[PDB]
mmCIF file of C-alpha atoms and ligand atoms in Angstrom:
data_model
loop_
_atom_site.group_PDB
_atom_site.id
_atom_site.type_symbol
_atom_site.label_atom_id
_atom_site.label_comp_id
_atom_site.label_asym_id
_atom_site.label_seq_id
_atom_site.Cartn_x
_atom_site.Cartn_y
_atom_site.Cartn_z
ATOM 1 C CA UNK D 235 26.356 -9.739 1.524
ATOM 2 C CA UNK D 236 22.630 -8.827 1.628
ATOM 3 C CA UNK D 237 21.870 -6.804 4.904
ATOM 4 C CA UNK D 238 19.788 -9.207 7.371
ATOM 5 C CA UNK D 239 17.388 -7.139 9.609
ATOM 6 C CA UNK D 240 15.688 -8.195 12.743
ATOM 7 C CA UNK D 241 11.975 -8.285 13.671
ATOM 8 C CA UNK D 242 10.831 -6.706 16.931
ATOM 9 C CA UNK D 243 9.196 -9.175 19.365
ATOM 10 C CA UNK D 244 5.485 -8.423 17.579
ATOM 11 C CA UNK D 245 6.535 -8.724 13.783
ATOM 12 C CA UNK D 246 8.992 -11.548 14.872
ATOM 13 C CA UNK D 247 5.566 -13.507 16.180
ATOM 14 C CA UNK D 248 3.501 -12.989 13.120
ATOM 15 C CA UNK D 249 6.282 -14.232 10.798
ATOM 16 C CA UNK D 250 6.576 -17.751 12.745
ATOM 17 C CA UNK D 251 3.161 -18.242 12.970
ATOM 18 C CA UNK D 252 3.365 -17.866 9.085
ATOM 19 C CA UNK D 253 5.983 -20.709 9.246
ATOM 20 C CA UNK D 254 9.524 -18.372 9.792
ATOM 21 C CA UNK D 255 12.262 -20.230 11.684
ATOM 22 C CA UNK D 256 15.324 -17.503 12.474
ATOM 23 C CA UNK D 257 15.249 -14.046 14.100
ATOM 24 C CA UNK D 258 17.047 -12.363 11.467
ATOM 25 C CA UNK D 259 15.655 -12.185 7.866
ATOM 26 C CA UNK D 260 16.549 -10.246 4.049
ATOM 27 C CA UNK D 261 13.877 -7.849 3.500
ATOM 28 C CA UNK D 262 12.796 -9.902 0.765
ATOM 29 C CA UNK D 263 12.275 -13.154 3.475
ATOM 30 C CA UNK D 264 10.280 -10.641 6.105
ATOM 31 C CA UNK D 265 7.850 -9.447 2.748
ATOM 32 C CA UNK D 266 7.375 -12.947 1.862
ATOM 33 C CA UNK D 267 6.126 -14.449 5.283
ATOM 34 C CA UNK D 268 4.181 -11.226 5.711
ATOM 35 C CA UNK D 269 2.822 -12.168 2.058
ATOM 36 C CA UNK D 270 2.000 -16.004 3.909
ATOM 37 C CA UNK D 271 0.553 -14.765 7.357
ATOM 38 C CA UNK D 272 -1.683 -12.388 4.924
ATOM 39 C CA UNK D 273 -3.010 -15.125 3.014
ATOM 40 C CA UNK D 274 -3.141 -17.673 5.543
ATOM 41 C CA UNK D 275 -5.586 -15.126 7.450
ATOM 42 C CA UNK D 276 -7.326 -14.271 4.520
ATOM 43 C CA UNK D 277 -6.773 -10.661 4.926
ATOM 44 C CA UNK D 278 -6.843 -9.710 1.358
ATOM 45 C CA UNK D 279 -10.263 -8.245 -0.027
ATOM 46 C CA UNK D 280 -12.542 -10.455 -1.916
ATOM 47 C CA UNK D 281 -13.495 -8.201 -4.576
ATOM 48 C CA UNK D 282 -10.191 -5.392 -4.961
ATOM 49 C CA UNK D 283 -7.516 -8.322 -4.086
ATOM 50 C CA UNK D 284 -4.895 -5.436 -3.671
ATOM 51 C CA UNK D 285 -6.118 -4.568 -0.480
ATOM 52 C CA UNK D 286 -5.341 -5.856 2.653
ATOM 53 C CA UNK D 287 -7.830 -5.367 5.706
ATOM 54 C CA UNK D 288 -6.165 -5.410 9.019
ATOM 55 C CA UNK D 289 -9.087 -3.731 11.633
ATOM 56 C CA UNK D 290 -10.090 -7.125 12.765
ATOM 57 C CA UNK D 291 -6.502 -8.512 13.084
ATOM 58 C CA UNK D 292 -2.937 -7.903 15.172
ATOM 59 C CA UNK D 293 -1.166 -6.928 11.924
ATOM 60 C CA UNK D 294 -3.780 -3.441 11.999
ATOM 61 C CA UNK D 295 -1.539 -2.509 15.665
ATOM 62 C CA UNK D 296 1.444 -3.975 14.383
ATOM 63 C CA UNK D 297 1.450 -1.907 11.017
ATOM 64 C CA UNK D 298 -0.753 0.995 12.350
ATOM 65 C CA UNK D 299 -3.687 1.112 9.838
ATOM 66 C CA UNK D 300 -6.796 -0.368 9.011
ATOM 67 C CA UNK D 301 -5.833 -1.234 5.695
ATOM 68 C CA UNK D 302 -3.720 -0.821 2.927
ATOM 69 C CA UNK D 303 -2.520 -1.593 -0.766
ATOM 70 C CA UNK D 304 0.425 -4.385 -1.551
ATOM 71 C CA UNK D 305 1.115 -2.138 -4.566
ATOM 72 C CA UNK D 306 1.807 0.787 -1.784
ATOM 73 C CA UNK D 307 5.556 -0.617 -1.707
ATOM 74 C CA UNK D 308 7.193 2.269 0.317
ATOM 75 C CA UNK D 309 4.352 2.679 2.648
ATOM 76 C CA UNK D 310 4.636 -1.350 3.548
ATOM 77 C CA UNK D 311 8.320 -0.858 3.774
ATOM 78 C CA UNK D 312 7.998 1.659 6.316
ATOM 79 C CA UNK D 313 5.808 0.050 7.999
ATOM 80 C CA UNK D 314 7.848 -2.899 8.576
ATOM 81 C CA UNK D 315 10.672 -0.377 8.970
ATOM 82 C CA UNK D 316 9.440 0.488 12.168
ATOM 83 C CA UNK D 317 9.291 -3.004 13.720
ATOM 84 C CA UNK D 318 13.213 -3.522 13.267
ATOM 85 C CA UNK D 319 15.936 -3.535 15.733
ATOM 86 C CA UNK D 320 18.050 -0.329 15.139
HETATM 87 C C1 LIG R 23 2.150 -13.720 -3.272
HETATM 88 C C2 LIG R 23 0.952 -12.984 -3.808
HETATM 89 O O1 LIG R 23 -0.122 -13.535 -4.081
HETATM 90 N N1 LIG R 23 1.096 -11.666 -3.985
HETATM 91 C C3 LIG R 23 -0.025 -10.848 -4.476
HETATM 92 C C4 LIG R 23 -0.434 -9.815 -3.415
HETATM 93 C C5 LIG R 23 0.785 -9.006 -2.954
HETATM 94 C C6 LIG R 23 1.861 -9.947 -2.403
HETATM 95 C C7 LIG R 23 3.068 -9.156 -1.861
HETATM 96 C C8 LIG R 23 3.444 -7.968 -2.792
HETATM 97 C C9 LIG R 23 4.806 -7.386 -2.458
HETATM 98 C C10 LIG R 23 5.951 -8.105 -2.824
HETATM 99 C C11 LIG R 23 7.224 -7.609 -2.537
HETATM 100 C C12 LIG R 23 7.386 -6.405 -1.892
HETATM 101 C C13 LIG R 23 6.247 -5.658 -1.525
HETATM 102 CL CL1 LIG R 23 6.478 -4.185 -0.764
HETATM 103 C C14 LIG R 23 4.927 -6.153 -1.805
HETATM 104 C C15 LIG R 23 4.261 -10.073 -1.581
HETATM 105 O O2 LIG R 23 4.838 -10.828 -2.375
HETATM 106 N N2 LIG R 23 4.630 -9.944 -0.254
HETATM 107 C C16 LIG R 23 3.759 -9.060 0.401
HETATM 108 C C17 LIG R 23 3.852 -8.652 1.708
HETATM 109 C C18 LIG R 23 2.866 -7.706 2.107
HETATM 110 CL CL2 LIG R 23 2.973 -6.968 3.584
HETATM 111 C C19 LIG R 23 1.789 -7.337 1.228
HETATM 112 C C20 LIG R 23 1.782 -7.811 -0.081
HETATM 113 C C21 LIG R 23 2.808 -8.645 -0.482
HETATM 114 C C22 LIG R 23 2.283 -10.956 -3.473
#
């Protein structure tokens, strides 16, 4: 079996407004409804489309940065990392 983690309350909220259903998720679920909420708020940057801005939305408190890269792969798991139930 594939370890399910669970979403603290903020995360959890983001990933149902990008369409999630459950409270507990595979990493690889919880990276893909990020990857929806993301595009659905057009976060990425017009011009360098690996970068995600986040200083005019929640996900900049819920992550802790202004922005950063989707090929930064162990920075993004950390940061999701620390919105889990331990
Ligand atoms: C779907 C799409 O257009 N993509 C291009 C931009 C990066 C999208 C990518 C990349 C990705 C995938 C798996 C693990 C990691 Cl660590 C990163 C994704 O899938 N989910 C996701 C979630 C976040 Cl927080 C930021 C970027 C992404 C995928």
């Amino acid at each position: 079996m594939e370890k399910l983690v669970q979403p603290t309350p903020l995360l959890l909220s983001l990933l149902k407004s990008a369409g999630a259903q459950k409270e507990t998720f595979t990493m690889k679920e919880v990276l893909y409804h990020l990857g929806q909420y993301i595009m659905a708020k057009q976060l990425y940057d017009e011009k360098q489309q690996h970068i995600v801005h986040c200083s005019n939305d929640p996900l900049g408190e819920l992550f802790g940065v202004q922005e950063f890269s989707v090929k930064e792969h162990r920075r993004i798991y950390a940061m999701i990392s620390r919105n889990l139930v331990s």
